[PDB]
């Protein structure tokens, strides 16, 4: 309700005047640190190729993951990507398929 010591607690944003704290709307937005933000951050909506590992709260932003078989990375945040089923000729499985990489063959 009060901004404690000039900040608003996690899961809240601060008003313009800075006299009152306001809670984020569970499921639509969130904030994680004590803050003086004019308004809360929008929750990340999982893609169709992704699963929701953890749902969005006020205090936390949803965590999404690539569905079994796929992975992602910095340059491919749009659509998760199929792992390769195996290696080429004269190369072997070293690293597995994860939600964050391809298999690695050497």
């Amino acid at each position, epitope marked *: 309700s009060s*901004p404690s*010591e*000039g*900040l608003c607690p996690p899961g809240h944003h*601060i008003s313009e005047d*800075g006299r009152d704290c306001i809670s984020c709307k569970y499921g639509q937005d969130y904030s994680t*640190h*004590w*803050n*003086d*933000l*004019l*308004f809360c*951050l*929008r929750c990340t909506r999982c893609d169709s190729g992704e699963v929701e590992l953890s749902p969005c709260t006020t205090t936390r932003n949803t965590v999404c993951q690539c569905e079994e078989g796929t992975f992602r990375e*910095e340059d491919s*945040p749009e659509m998760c990507r199929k792992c390769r089923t195996g290696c080429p000729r004269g190369m072997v499985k070293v690293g597995d398929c994860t939600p964050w990489s391809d298999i690695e063959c050497v």
Partner: antibody
Amino acid sequence: EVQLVESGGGLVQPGGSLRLSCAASGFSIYSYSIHWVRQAPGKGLEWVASISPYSGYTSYADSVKGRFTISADTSKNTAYLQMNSLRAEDTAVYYCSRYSSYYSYYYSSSSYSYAMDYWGQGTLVTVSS
Amino acid sequence: DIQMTQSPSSLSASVGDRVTITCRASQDVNTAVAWYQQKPGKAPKLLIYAASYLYSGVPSRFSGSGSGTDFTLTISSLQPEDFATYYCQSSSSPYTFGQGTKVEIKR
């Protein structure tokens, strides 16, 4: 007089480190928020990163996440931007900037604008072999 | 993910003309847009903050005047020295600037 002299820009090889340094004088970096924002030659502005020492909070842009790291040393009253695995696309003039929040008010009794209200002169970074 | 869209990308106006640069945010941002004047070589300068507030020391001829999705910087008696690129920026969220609007002085 407030000013934010930055330093550290210059020529880097692709896939290389480059630390920018934003030296704040005339005020206390703590109670404020310091954002870096960059501009590719002849093009518009693009916010890179932010850091608010009063809370501990950092945010970055996605076109820079996991490569760039923002930091700040109240003792030295500077803010940094460590730039790693640089690309040709990162070449720009990087600006640092003071951002008046409200804790700005609670702390020093500033006037806040919830905007970037002082900008450093900017150093150029060019990434090319 | 917000996107600030300015209009126009460029204009020509004569000294003493009234210039009007407008800027439309893709999502609603309350009154949380700022406006910046950037001149060649120099770093951006904040003119209007909050949407309609004149930043300290800026000339009164600059006027910010929006709320919601649509926002309108009005340069009033355009001067020789107002040749500059001008950006509306959603502040509070991600800090998306607009593509910029380019004013040049007709003579």
